[PDB]
Design a protein around this ligand. Structure first.
Ligand SMILES: O=C1Cc2cc(Nc3ncncc3Cl)ccc2N1
Ligand SMILES: O=C1Cc2cc(Nc3ncncc3Cl)ccc2N1
Ligand SMILES: [Cl-]
Ligand SMILES: [Cl-]
Lengths: 4, 124, 124, 4
């Protein structure tokens, strides 16, 4: 999971 | 927004759509190419091809279970492109590049047409 | 094999599937949640959820145009997860995390359940 | 395009  | 994003989600979705295609699950159309038949999902074809997008948004054609391609279309070229649609992988070879590019132009798959043009230009 | 791969293909496919959902094109099922209705594509739901995979591979249920979820399922939690299925983006907030995790457990969306468990553990 |  990432900060887009 | 303040969303988080799962990097591998799109790839996992496509992998699962290809597993459904393999097992012939919920396929809703047959594409006929020079008497070679390919089962697929209309939505995936539309998501990948300007031609299929135009075909399945047509009020009459959206309801067809069989689509016949132009007789000049090569079945191997189509098969390679159908595999690409469901995997992101293009089996481009010296022996098939002309058929693949001609099929991608007809199907309106601009990124495929682009890499074929470049690979051909490198060999001249 | 000796394939080449188009990096953005899977993401572009999912983006186009979401555009079809937005315009209600070729959606083939309604998911009913506490009298809130959500239109979707069976194949995308199956590609994202172990529950929908099991439902639409069932010989009788594969033919249903309406699926009713368990009344304990929250419509907002479902909406957030449906958006995630079609975009890879999860709108996870302090105010919705419990409903989102409960809905992801029911839908069998293991990666979502994982990030919810971790975000909850960070706040304790 | 890349070599996967
Ligand atoms: O090269 C290409 C690939 C491609 C895909 C589509 N598909 C869609 N476009 C927009 N909204 C939904 C969909 Cl399904 C249309 C044109 C082209 N041209
Ligand atoms: O967490 C998850 C996400 C998910 C998706 C599916 N889908 C499929 N699996 C295998 N072949 C085809 C499909 Cl469509 C099954 C289980 C789970 N569990
Ligand atoms: Cl393309
Ligand atoms: Cl997930």
């Amino acid at each position: 999971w990432v900060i887009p | 927004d303040s969303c988080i994003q799962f990097t591998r989600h799109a790839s996992d979705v496509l992998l699962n759509l290809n597993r459904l295609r393999s097992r012939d699950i919920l396929t809703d159309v047959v594409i006929v190419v020079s008497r070679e038949q390919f089962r697929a999902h209309k939505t995936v074809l539309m998501a990948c091809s300007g031609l299929f997008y135009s075909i399945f948004t047509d009020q009459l054609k959206c309801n067809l279970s069989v689509i016949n391609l132009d007789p000049e279309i090569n079945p191997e070229g189509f098969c390679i492109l159908l595999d690409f649609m469901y995997t992101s992988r293009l089996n481009l070879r010296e022996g098939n590049i002309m058929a693949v590019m001609a099929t991608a132009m007809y199907l309106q798959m601009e990124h495929v047409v682009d890499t074929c043009r470049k690979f051909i230009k490198a060999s001249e």
